[PDB]
Write a protein that binds this ligand. Structure first.
Ligand SMILES: Nc1nc2c(ncn2[C@@H]2O[C@H](COP(=O)(O)OP(=O)(O)OP(=O)(O)O)[C@@H](O)[C@H]2O)c(=O)[nH]1
Length: 461
């Protein structure tokens, strides 16, 4: 990805976008009961913690577009992946405005908490207005579409969340490139059924894990994988994507019946952005907050791994590449070992920066013992080994519980963490409950006991 030009939004007729300058994150009732070194991310240029320019930092993720055309390898990658997706009989039809708005099987209703985007964020109009669950009315939306059309600018916000001390000092704050409600609705009508097919089929056929339920999916993963596992992390995956990767994605879409709307992909690739008082244009880069960002990122990842394998190992049998991606995160396997380090070298030629899995210093062998997917490890249940526990490290849970945004969501926030925590074992879980109950707020929460979670889990398969 690369910014082509950035200039004052007033110069081109665009209103300044107001974005809070104060984090909504504050120490929680458990701030001193657990250990943690993370803090809220910088939201403005004036933050005293900054040790470098904020603007240069937030936009440095756009490292450039390393490649131009779609080469032979990418093309074969496209053919093979499109091939697998073909076996799903994905309904190529357009999704009706109603289902796209309020949901249907395989697709959840639009989230009312996320920004409505332009021009609404300038008008003031919000989502709770335009639509409402009960009536499942399209009228207002259906009207607003004709009123403002599509291909509307993306409102860029700094993501209010926790970041390491380094990310704070280097101004490495993540951005939320918000999609207009209109576009979000259009794209969901355009690809609605595709999204549903993926959500309903997480695995090695879609090579996607989007919409999955870790408590149940983790037991299926090991079986779907080939003998030898391999993985690696990406640095700035989204922002690093070059236009050619979007064209490759369009080729896949065309081959499975969505050629009549690949135009949408062009806006993800060549996009118009609004941030604060400035406006900018980006060539390449997957925007973080559009409808389908995850799924399209996962699809592109399926193309990238295939490509690197074809360019590094002529003769490789893709039919035996078993991989599952979630955006840039991925768990892959092959019957034979492969040099991740070498693959990373090839990745650099495609504009991708790949490094050892889980911040390792060097590329080492990936095992069922050290492999993670979505930050969770895989651990067979001590009593019934065929059931696999997705294990989120307690450190992550500790970092999170130490802060709050809304005291009203303390119950849900803590309950949610408990659903992640218990997989670490009964002992660890009770120590976690004990610390939570060591202060008034915790003692008042309705928290599930271990036995209850475990038995429920056992019965869920
Ligand atoms: N900008 C942005 N990225 C998001 C969001 N949600 C998930 N991501 C993903 O998070 C990535 C950014 O991660 P960072 O922590 O900044 O760093 P990194 O890319 O993992 O690279 P490292 O510095 O090596 O850890 C993007 O490339 C996306 O894949 C979001 O709301 N905004």
């Amino acid at each position: 990805g690369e910014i082509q030009w950035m200039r004052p939004s007033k110069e081109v007729g665009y209103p300044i976008i107001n974005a809070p300058s104060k984090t909504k994150l504050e120490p929680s009732a458990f701030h001193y009961v657990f250990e943690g070194v993370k803090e809220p991310a910088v939201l403005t240029k004036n933050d005293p913690r900054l040790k470098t320019d904020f603007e240069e930092a937030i936009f440095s993720k756009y490292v450039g577009n390393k490649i131009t055309e779609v080469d032979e390898y990418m093309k074969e990658a496209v053919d093979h992946y499109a091939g697998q997706l073909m076996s799903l009989d994905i309904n190529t039809e357009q999704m009706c405005l109603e289902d796209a708005m309020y949901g249907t099987d395989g697709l959840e209703a639009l989230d009312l908490s996320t920004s409505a985007g332009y021009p609404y964020v300038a008008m003031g109009k919000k989502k709770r207005d335009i639509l409402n669950k009960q009536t499942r009315d399209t009228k207002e939306m259906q009207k607003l579409l004709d009123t403002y059309g599509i291909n509307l600018p993306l409102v860029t916000y700094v993501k209010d969340e926790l970041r390491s001390k380094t990310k704070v000092e280097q101004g490495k704050s993540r951005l939320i490139e918000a999609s207009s409600l209109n576009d979000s609705v259009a794209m969901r009508m355009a690809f609605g059924n595709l999204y549903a097919a993926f959500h309903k089929n997480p695995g090695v056929i879609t090579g996607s894990a989007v919409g999955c339920d870790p408590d149940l999916f983790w037991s299926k993963i090991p079986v779907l994988m080939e003998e030898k596992l391999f993985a690696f992390d990406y640095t700035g995956y989204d922002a690093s994507l070059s236009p050619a990767w979007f064209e490759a994605l369009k080729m896949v879409l065309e081959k499975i019946g969505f050629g009549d709307r690949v135009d949408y992909i062009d806006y993800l690739n060549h996009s118009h952005h609004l941030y604060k008082n400035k406006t900018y244009c980006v060539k390449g880069g997957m925007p973080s907050g559009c409808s389908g960002t995850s799924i399209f990122n996962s699809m592109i990842n399926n193309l990238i791994i295939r490509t690197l394998l074809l360019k590094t190992y002529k003769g490789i049998d893709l039919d035996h590449l078993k991989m599952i991606a979630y955006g840039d995160d991925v768990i892959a396997s092959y019957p034979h070992e492969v040099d991740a380090s070498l693959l990373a070298q090839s990745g650099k030629d495609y504009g991708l920066t790949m490094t050892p899995a889980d911040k390792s210093a060097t590329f080492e062998t990936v095992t069922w013992e050290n492999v993670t997917f979505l930050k969770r490890f895989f651990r067979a249940d001590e009593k019934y080994p065929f059931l696999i526990h997705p294990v989120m490290p307690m450190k992550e849970i500790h970092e999170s519980i130490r802060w709050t945004k809304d005291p009203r969501n303390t119950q849900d926030h803590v309950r949610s963490l408990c659903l992640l925590a218990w997989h670490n074992g009964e002992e660890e879980y009770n120590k976690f409950l004990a610390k939570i109950r060591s202060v008034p707020i915790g003692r008042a929460l309705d928290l599930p006991e271990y036995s209850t979670l475990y038995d429920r889990w056992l019965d869920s398969f």
